[PDB]
Amino acid sequence: EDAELLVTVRGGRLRGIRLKTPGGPVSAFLGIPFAEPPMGPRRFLPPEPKQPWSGVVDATTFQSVCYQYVDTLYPGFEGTEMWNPNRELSEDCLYLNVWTPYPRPTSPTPVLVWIYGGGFYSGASSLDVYDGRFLVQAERTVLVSMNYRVGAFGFLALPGSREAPGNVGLLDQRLALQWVQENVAAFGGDPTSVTLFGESAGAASVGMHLLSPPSRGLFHRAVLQSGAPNGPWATVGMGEARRRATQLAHLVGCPNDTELVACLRTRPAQVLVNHEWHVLPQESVFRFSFVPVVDGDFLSDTPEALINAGDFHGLQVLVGVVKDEGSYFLVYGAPGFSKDNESLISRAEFLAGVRVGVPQVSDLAAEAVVLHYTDWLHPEDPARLREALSDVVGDHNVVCPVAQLAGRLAAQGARVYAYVFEHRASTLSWPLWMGVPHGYEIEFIFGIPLDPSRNYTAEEKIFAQRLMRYWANFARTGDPNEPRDPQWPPYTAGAQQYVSLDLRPLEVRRGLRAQACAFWNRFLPKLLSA
């Protein structure tokens, strides 16, 4: 019996598994329960702490994936399938995973906590691209990742009601962070050095923990990759959440909040999932049905409001974006777009595309978008129209909300580092026109290129090692920089400096799409208020 793979936590005893990497072994504890199964009467409710167990919990394999929609846009295509559930779906899904060096650290080790981010409707800690073994081995941190409820199960809200208060998937995350505070020391982790990192909806999640005081005491540093809590997709108003929840009930044969939720509770999980997309108010891309709601509780105000009012002295943040944030989303509803052609669209498609990529705004607001994103010397060139609509969706949804967050945080006391990730993976299965799409820096951060059975280049492995070092440096010291030899400067509202991350050495540049983001962040809100 291997003693390194036996751990006792507050709830009881666990048995882990030894994992191999090209650099040596790692200890892994997978499928550790942190909450009571949120089933039956517990669907839509805040998570309850896992009651203590007797015996030894088998923690050698990933647990079930939280019930969610399965992407069938391109059946059998790696580009979409790598994000789909790779374990059975279940509402009994509140488990987390701990990876630690082998043998276990005998002294307090810095902790990284990963939050996955498929638009709050999808994701799992078990996805191959989130394999913690390489980061933990190379950088000697403790890595934790958790499953949290998504879609209706995590975010359906009838605001004010006790039966479906909203944001429960976020509370799942907070519970797991509490679990980390109380139990990570048993693995060698240092609960006084916990860095949150997340991508997309996971990045929005991290930002939300920053702005919610009960969570703020559970970690120390934050990394937000291609996502921000002030994103136009990341929250929904009380009224619109109530309407979406109400339409879901109607669509599945249910009728008073109590009676409505009770009837929803009798429905099979899959039935809810089958009608998830139908509650959106219009055809769109980069919009999701069930997301965090501003209700006065978890978020006492809108993320924008909470951001502007915040004192962020003592906070270090790492934020950044990929080179082509918008491209991926275009194939899910923008007219003329497909991974299977050049997607060289026409002006008319571009214009219809703008209403899809910027849904629910006035005709005037749309016209303003078209003004800023048209090259009036080349108003009808298909290649430029393709690039421009990608820019619209990417700026509006990701780049500009991240830039706004970064600027406010920097100006209000936080030390901020910003990056643009510009490397297109040699193994990327998406077409060349998509460039470096959303989500495709993650495999480098997790050091997936070090996996021998995969086809990455020697250069790419070295690059992955650089990135793991930046991320782990940040977790350890709040500063990604290595000892001097080209330096990564902090981002500030004025100088707006960030670095490019690719195969070349760090290059320092200015402005996260400053011209475009002035529009989304300064002008467009004024317009919409009148």
Ligand X SMILES: C/C=C1\[C@H]2C=C(C)C[C@]1(N)c1ccc(=O)[nH]c1C2
Ligand Y SMILES: *[C@@H]1O[C@H](CO[C@@H]2O[C@@H](C)[C@@H](O)[C@@H](O)[C@@H]2O)[C@@H](O[C@@H]2O[C@H](CO)[C@@H](O)[C@H](O)[C@H]2NC(C)=O)[C@H](O)[C@H]1NC(C)=O
Ligand Z SMILES: *[C@@H]1O[C@H](CO)[C@@H](O)[C@H](O)[C@H]1NC(C)=O
Chain residues binding ligand Y by CB under 6 A are 335-338, 340-342, 344
Contact 297, 167 (CB under 8 A): yes
Q: Is 116 annotated as a binding residue?
A: no
Q: Is 102 annotated as a binding residue?
A: no
- Cα 444 from Cα 441, distance rounded (Å): 5
- Cα 145 from Cα 31, distance rounded (Å): 10
The sheet carrying 56-58 orders its strands as 6-9, 12-15, 56-58
Is 517 a residue that touches a copy of itself (CB under 8 A)? yes
Backbone angles phi, psi at 345, to 5 degrees: -85, 165
Report in angstroms the alpha-carbon separations of 266 from 252, 253, 272, 352, 358.
11, 11, 11, 40, 36
371 binds, among ligand X, ligand Z, a copy of itself, none (CB under 5 to 8 A by kind): a copy of itself
Of the pair 259, 367, the CB lying nearest ligand Z is at 259
336 binds, among a copy of itself, ligand Y, ligand X, none (CB under 5 to 8 A by kind): ligand Y
Reply yes or no on whether 438 is catalytic: yes
Contact pick of 31, 118, 189, 357 for ligand X (by CB under 6 A): 118
DSSP designation for 494:
T
Q: Which element (helix H / strand E) includes 459?
A: helix 458-477
Q: Is 237 annotated as a binding residue?
A: no
* Catalytic-labelled residue, pool 139, 276, 304, 325: 325
Q: Is 498 annotated as a binding residue?
A: no
Contact pick of 311, 313, 376, 432 for a copy of itself (by CB under 8 A): 376
* Catalytic-labelled residue, pool 64, 200, 343, 390: 200
Q: Is 130 annotated as a binding residue?
A: yes
Contact 313, 413 (CB under 8 A): yes
Of the pair 153, 520, the CB lying nearest a copy of itself is at 520
Q: List the one residue out of 367, 529, 356, 449 whose CA is nearest residue 21.
A: 449
Reply yes or no on whether 325 is catalytic: yes
* Least distance (Å) between residue 335 CB and ligand Y: 4
Instruction: Sketch the per residue contact string, 154 through 193, with ligand X: x for CB under 6 A, - otherwise.
Output: ----------------------------------------
322 strand-pairing partners: 421
Report in angstroms the alpha-carbon separations of 11 from 28, 54, 223, 465.
18, 8, 30, 36
Is 519 a residue that touches a copy of itself (CB under 8 A)? yes
Residues in binding contact with a copy of itself, number by CB under 8 A? 22
Q: Which of residues 54-73 bind ligand X (CB under 6 A)?
A: 71
* Least distance (Å) between residue 127 CB and ligand X: 6
Contact 512, 418 (CB under 8 A): yes
Is 510 a residue that touches a copy of itself (CB under 8 A)? yes
Dihedral, 163, 165, 166, 168 alpha carbons, nearest 10: -70
* Least distance (Å) between residue 398 CB and ligand X: 10
- Cα 473 from Cα 529, distance rounded (Å): 43
- Cα 491 from Cα 317, distance rounded (Å): 10
Angle at 267 between CA 261 and CA 273, to 5 degrees: 100
Q: Which of residues 409-448 bind ligand X (CB under 6 A)?
A: 438-439
Reply yes or no on whether 200 is catalytic: yes
Q: Is 83 annotated as a binding residue?
A: yes
Of the pair 5, 164, the CB lying nearest ligand Z is at 164
* Least distance (Å) between residue 527 CB and a copy of itself: 7
Annotated binding-site members for huperzine A:
83, 130, 328
Annotated binding-site members for galanthamine:
83, 199-200, 328
Residues that bind ligand X (CB under 6 A): 71, 83, 116-119, 122-123, 127, 200, 328, 438-439
Active site residues: 200, 325, 438
Annotated binding-site members:
83, 119, 130, 199-200, 328, 430, 438
